[PDB]
A paper describes a structure:
[name] is a [name] malaria transmission-blocking vaccine candidate that is anchored to the parasite surface through a C-terminal glycosylphosphatidylinositol (GPI) moiety, and plays a role in parasite survival in the mosquito midgut. [name] contains epidermal growth factor (EGF)-like domains and is part of a family of sexual stage malaria proteins that includes the related vaccine antigen Pfs25. [name] is a glycosylphosphatidylinositol-anchored protein expressed on the surface of zygotes and ookinetes and plays a similar role as Pfs25 in ookinete survival and traversal through the midgut. [name] is a GPI-anchored protein, consisting of an N-terminal signal sequence, four EGF-like domains, and a C-terminal hydrophobic sequence that is the site of GPI attachment.
The construct used for crystallography consisted of V1-S173, comprising only the four EGF-like domains. The crystal structure of [name] was solved to a resolution of 2.3 Å. The [name] structure is comprised of four EGF-like domains in a triangular arrangement, with sides of 40 Å and 50 Å and a thickness of ~ 20 Å, with the overall structure stabilized by 10 disulfide bridges. EGF domains 1–3 adopt the characteristic structure, consisting of a major two-stranded β-sheet followed by a loop and a shorter two-stranded β-sheet, while only a single two-stranded β-sheet in EGF4 was observed. EGF domains 1 and 4 each have two disulfide bridges, while EGF domains 2 and 3 contain three disulfide bridges. Due to flexibility and a lack of clear density at the C-terminus of the protein, the C-terminal portion of EGF4 (residues S157-S173) could not be modelled. The major difference between the structures of the two antigens lies in the lack of the third disulfide bridge in EGF4 of [name]. This is reflected in the greater degree of disorder present in EGF4 of [name] compared to Pfs25, such that its C-terminal region could not be resolved in the crystal structure. However, the crystal packing of [name] did not adopt a similar tile-like pattern and we also saw no evidence of interaction between Pfs25 and [name] as measured by BLI.
Numbering used by the authors: -1 to 155
Amino acid sequence: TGVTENTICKYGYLIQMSNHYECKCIEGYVLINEDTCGKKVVCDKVENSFKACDEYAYCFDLGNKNNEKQIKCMCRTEYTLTAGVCVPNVCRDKVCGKGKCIVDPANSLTHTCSCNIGTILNQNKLCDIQGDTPCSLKCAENEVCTLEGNYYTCKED
């Protein structure tokens, strides 16, 4: 199973889309897993290899028959680039319309689309249908569900 209403996001907070929950990271952090974030690290040392450097990305160093550092921010294993951002392999060059491609929690072998609020998912797994999903987050004390762009999130009053 992926992110649910009771999922705890390490160094991140819960957001709600039309048909799924997701974890979004605190300032200065990026996603390692669906529910885990780590500090965004600058890839400028071999000592920093495999540290978080972007969403689903970690620092990677190449020894191209060299002694110099050849380091870049690379998609973690089981992830690949799509539209300039690392995505799950099941999301390789997949489109969602008004939504975000994710791993399908009901079947890890396929992808699905987490649709922006105001759009629901069509039977072809495209976010191109107009529907309004109510907010189902459990917000903390002195907090209220707030629509921030494409996703609901709990915000302070």
